[PDB]
Design a protein around this ligand. Structure first.
Ligand SMILES: c1ncc2c(n1)NCC2
Length: 165
């Protein structure tokens, strides 16, 4: 089970941890991937989760895209969690670096409400370019199910906790 998390609200928890390492340890029912519409897991959380699956996540994702086409920004799909989780919920937050509507971040977090408990990163944070403090605020104000947030960067984790309202 999840350990060492700081409780932020009734249902949101946070820990300074590598989501890949957290997933291998806990083997949650759902690990959230910070996906793009093409499910091209090149970098950030997606690249790290995919590399941990020995590229099996990318092979499965390419078959999903070949069949279904790309996801919408703000959308998601449930695929296998491979050696990391029972399932991976690939969620597409807006990539601010690609000029995408930051208002789609709430729509992206709404996908989490379809799962009772999730291990997740902050959507649109990191290489997606959004303000992680804003992402945490949207997470707490949108997600009603139990979300265990893994924040890789210690300095960002401290900033998120110390500024949390
Ligand atoms: C949480 N947030 C970001 C990352 C992570 N976990 N693993 C590597 C990049």
């Amino acid at each position: 089970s999840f350990s060492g998390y700081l409780k932020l609200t009734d249902n949101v928890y946070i820990k300074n941890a590598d989501i890949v390492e957290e997933a291998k340890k806990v083997k949650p029912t759902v690990v959230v991937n910070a996906a793009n519409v093409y499910l091209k897991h090149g970098g950030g959380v997606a690249g790290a989760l995919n590399k941990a699956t020995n590229n099996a996540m990318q092979v499965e994702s390419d078959d999903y895209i070949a069949t279904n086409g790309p996801l919408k920004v703000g959308g998601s799909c449930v695929l296998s969690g491979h050696n990391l989780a029972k399932h991976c919920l690939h969620v597409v937050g807006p990539n601010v670096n690609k000029g995408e509507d930051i208002q789609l971040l709430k729509s992206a977090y709404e996908n989490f409400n379809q799962h009772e408990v999730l291990l997740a990163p902050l959507l649109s944070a990191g290489i997606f370019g959004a303000d992680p403090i804003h992402s945490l605020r949207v997470c707490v104000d949108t997600v009603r199910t139990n979300v265990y947030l893994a924040v890789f960067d210690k300095n960002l984790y401290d900033k998120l906790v110390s500024s949390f309202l």
